[PDB]
Amino acid sequence: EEQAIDEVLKIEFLELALGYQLISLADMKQGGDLLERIRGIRKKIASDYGFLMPQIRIRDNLQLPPTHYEIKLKGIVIGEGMVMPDKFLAMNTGFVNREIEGIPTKEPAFGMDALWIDAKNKEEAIIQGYTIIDPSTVIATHTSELVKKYAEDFITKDEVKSLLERLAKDYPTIVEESKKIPTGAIRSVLQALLHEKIPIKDMLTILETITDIAPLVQNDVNILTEQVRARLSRVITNAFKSEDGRLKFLTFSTDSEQFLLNKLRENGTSKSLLLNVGELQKLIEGVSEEAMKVLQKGIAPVILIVEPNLRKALSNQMEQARIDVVVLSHAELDPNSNFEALGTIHIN
């Protein structure tokens, strides 16, 4: 025993641990690029979401099944999966002509259907309109999605201090004006944004909104979050456009929206839905089945668009039901972008 020391010197990071058979994906002498793909996430996340995470650590873990991987954050398992290191993943992204043969699976990043296929299958897969993704990329995309999920945690007091200071260099007045705001509130708003995958890369707007509005609402985080989000419609819409340039979404029918609004209650500044067991049931089936269809179309994340008053209440209700959706308000939609309605949820 000499682990008073390893504990003294330990830094906090995201850790990708690889089973024996996955190590070859990291071996550049073998042509694997997992190292660059994994190490290049931190910069992409920085430019898309506006925070700096510590570099991602890559370990072997021999206690793992040889094809399995495990992702840890502060030593706690937050994700795991497997790839066929010597195969390729083929996906229907909405242009498939004829289905091909392979091993069916659920891709780990979003739970979409896919086929593991051999290298020699790639050519015909491509002819049939499939998208092909290699093992390293699958792991990288998974890992990327997991850091987005836990983006909150990387927003420490020291990251907040560092974000202001990095803004101070050429907007020194607004950061100074922001010293008037309790720093727990700023931090708390930033976490609340990242919690729902809203980038904080526009600190100017964030700080300006908080500094303006906070004194008026006793630094209430529910109000500040919504107010800040309302001013980031360009950033929000851009962060959820599909790659074809369209933000693709579901809505609730008017009858359904009215039903939800009728069960909506405010207590202090906290909005919630007052639903019995059967009603909560109807709500969950309706969303989850429609979400299920969106994923089957090769589209993810599943986005729900509602009016301002339902956004937080619905979002809370979803994460408590463990339904992986994004909930957006009308106030957050950039009319300069293209939109596509995928379907309408009926709770009836």
Swiss-Prot record:
Domain of life: Bacteria
Subcellular compartments: Cell membrane
Family in the record: Belongs to the FHIPEP (flagella/HR/invasion proteins export pore) family.
Purpose of the protein: Involved in the export of flagellum proteins.
Protein name (record): Flagellar biosynthesis protein FlhA
Species this chain originates from: Helicobacter pylori (strain J99 / ATCC 700824) (Campylobacter pylori J99)
This protein's encoding gene: flhA
